[PDB]
């Protein structure tokens, strides 16, 4: 007789006590990760090897070729991709495209306008030493820098229906030359424009000529644009200069769940349900503290370094009849009885499962990106992202602290219940080696023939 004890030294925490030794305790938090950029349920990610979304979509020559790009679960961009827009410039609404790119899993590269179709403008001489392809001066592959043929730049009347039943991205840009001399060197018309238009687009773009600092050895800029061309919708380009024309579209094949991970790691031959920028998780427990911007069926982030359930006892417990926490007994947690003890171990799997079911409503952190002139919104996003994880890690800690408090109280209570069941059956304060399975058999089966043991009561009334 005696509640179970063990020298486990696996401490837990409750509200009233921050360190409580427990015989059997289960961790419910992943501190560990593969440290490898891993597959997501079999689908290989689009790992931009030292390259950017704008570089891939515009087709930077310094980047990987990316010919016939397959499906991807998620895109991996570095924090500072070295192969950015090679020819310097902005990318108009880059982050909206990246958010919109986070809702897709596959493209099909389709050819809007052939390079051969520029019968009146030079498609091939639109090259730059800032974008060298295999040593030779080159340009973005998917968009054609046009230059005048024979000191004349006729207006570019071009139109493309999205005859394809699926949606389409159409990329182009505007050149911003340093001076009017550089304008005249490339485009015979001094005042130029790019008047693009769709069913839901209207924009004219004069080039902003200005003296600028050198970036990648070139001071002229190149601001690129993107538009979602719906099916059965035409995009009509109309420019007499500075037109970085589209050569390839990007047909959206399947719209699904994805994200642009800001991860610096390299590929490892993996397969994992979950992925994190710092690695991958391979366990069913509900929490992790690696990095909140995960993808896949994953534990839900809490920024706690230490989060353990109490599935065991705290070490009257030591008062009178019971000897104490006798370590010798092994079978059973409370009184070596299958009625009370076997049900207790069955609830261990339910308790960890309850937190999975209960804290499934956690805030799923989403990867949003904002540019240098949207610092307020980014700080608003960061504090909203951090704030909810601050709320939910408090709820996880409070829930675990509460459940650790209840379960030790559950263990504290049912020991008193068995002691109460022992105490009420005996009906005597007599404590009562040699009488094994004569004194003890009546206790454990629950049947105590106290009138039959009234000789002890006669010895009780004799001895007092």
């Amino acid at each position: 007789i005696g509640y179970h004890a063990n020298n486990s030294t696996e401490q837990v925490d409750t509200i009233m006590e921050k360190n409580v030794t427990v015989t059997h305790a289960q961790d419910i938090l992943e501190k560990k990760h593969n440290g490898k950029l891993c597959d997501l349920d079999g689908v290989k990610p689009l790992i931009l090897r030292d390259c950017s979304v704008a570089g891939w979509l515009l087709g930077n020559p310094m980047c990987d070729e990316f010919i016939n790009v397959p499906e991807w679960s998620y895109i991996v961009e570095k924090a500072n991709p070295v192969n950015d827009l090679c020819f310097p410039g902005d990318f108009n609404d880059y982050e909206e495209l990246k958010h919109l790119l986070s809702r897709i899993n596959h493209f099909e590269k389709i050819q809007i306008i052939p390079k051969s179709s520029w019968s009146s403008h030079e498609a091939s001489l639109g090259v730059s030493s800032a974008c060298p392809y295999q040593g030779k001066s080159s340009f973005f592959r998917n968009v054609v820098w046009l230059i005048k043929k024979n000191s004349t730049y006729p207006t570019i009347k071009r139109s493309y229906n999205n005859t394809n039943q699926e949606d389409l991205l159409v990329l182009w840009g505007i050149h911003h030359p340093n001076d009017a001399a550089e304008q005249t060197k490339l485009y015979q018309n001094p005042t130029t424009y790019i008047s693009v238009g769709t069913s839901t687009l209207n924009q004219r773009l004069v080039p902003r000529i200005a003296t600028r600092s050198k970036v990648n050895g070139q001071s002229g800029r190149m601001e690129f644009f993107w538009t979602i061309l719906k099916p059965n919708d035409a995009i009509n380009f109309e420019s007499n200069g500075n037109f970085i024309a589209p050569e390839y579209a990007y047909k959206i094949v399947k719209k699904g769940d994805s994200t642009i991970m800001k991860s610096e790691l390299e590929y490892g031959n993996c397969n994992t349900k979950c992925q994190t920028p710092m690695g991958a998780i391979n366990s069913s427990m509900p929490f992790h503290n690696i990095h909140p911007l995960t993808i896949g069926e994953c534990p839900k982030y809490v920024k706690s370094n230490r989060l353990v359930l109490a599935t065991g006892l705290r070490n009257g417990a030591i008062a009178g009849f019971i000897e104490g926490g006798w370590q010798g007994m092994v079978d059973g947690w409370y009184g070596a009885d299958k009625e009370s003890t076997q049900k207790a171990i069955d609830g261990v799997t339910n308790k960890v499962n309850s937190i999975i079911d209960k804290m499934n409503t956690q805030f799923e952190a989403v990867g949003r990106e904002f540019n240098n002139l949207e610092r307020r919104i980014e700080n608003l996003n960061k504090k909203m992202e951090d704030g909810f994880l601050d709320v939910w890690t408090y709820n996880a800690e409070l829930l675990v602290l509460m459940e650790n408090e209840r379960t030790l109280d559950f263990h504290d209570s049912n020991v008193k219940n068995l002691y109460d069941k022992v105490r009420l059956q005996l009906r005597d304060n007599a404590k009562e080696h040699k009488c094994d399975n004569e004194c003890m058999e009546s206790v454990r089966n629950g049947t105590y023939d106290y009138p039959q043991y009234s000789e002890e009561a006669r010895l009780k009334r004799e001895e007092i």
Epitope: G42, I67, N269, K273
Partner: antibody, heavy 120, light 114 residues
């Protein structure tokens, strides 16, 4: 030495259920992933389903999802492929295929195959 | 979905000369993060199971005759037989494993003795 003997094929009605069984021998069954590949008469190979070593990643073909349920017993060294609501298109020799690499799914050793037929 | 297509469906190669079986892919099974062409090559005689020949599009499985040799990259791939034998009369299937949730085999090329 390395072998994958299949069993459980035979006559099936439309809509009937069938369970295949691929006994494994001559290799560590609980370290190499397993795959199911069907081949109808007069047609090419078609991958049916898949399961990893720890039964933690399972995949099905698009025509097979919601109808089959692959499983394995590592202790028994056997692989199973339940079938439910079978159409006439699954008249095929269901081959039992082992992928050596845990992630890469090139199929090294193949079984004899059981000619499942789904007809009146 | 990712679907493979083989240009020759019934190759007519006499004994002792070269046989080439092209297998295009809808999407490039190359993966630049390891530079490995996720492709397999199989061999199926009539009334026998498939036999893997070339995996990773170049690496040859143990026990395969040396006359087999895969090549190619990205979408286009080739299975080269240096000199056909009577035992090489079989239906040859190419199978990507870039997309693990959807492994798709090729249509199949059967080499016949001319």
């Amino acid at each position: 030495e390395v072998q994958l003997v299949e069993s459980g094929g035979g006559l099936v009605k439309p809509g009937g259920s069938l369970r295949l069984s691929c006994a494994a021998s001559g290799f560590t069954f609980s370290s190499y992933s397993m795959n199911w590949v069907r081949q109808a008469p007069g047609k090419g190979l078609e991958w049916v389903s898949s399961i990893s070593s720890s039964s933690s990643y399972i995949y099905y073909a698009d025509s097979v999802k919601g109808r089959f349920t692959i499983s394995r017993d590592n202790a028994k060294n056997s692989l199973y492929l339940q079938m439910n609501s079978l159409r006439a298109e699954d008249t095929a020799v269901y081959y039992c295929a082992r992928a050596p690499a845990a992630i890469s799914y090139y199929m090294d050793v193949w079984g004899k195959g059981t000619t499942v037929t789904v007809s009146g | 979905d990712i679907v493979m297509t083989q240009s020759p469906d019934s190759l007519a190669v006499s004994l002792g000369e070269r046989a080439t079986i092209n297998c295009k892919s809808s999407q490039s099974v190359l993966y630049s993060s390891n530079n490995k062409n996720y492709l397999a090559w199989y061999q199926q005689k009539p009334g026998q199971p498939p036999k893997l020949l070339i995996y990773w599009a170049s690496t040859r499985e143990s026990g395969v005759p040396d006359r087999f040799s895969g090549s190619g990259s990205g979408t286009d791939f080739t299975l080269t037989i240096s000199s056909l034998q009577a035992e090489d009369v079989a239906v040859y299937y190419c199978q990507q494993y870039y997309s693990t949730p959807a492994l798709t085999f090729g249509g199949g090329t059967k080499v016949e003795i001319k």
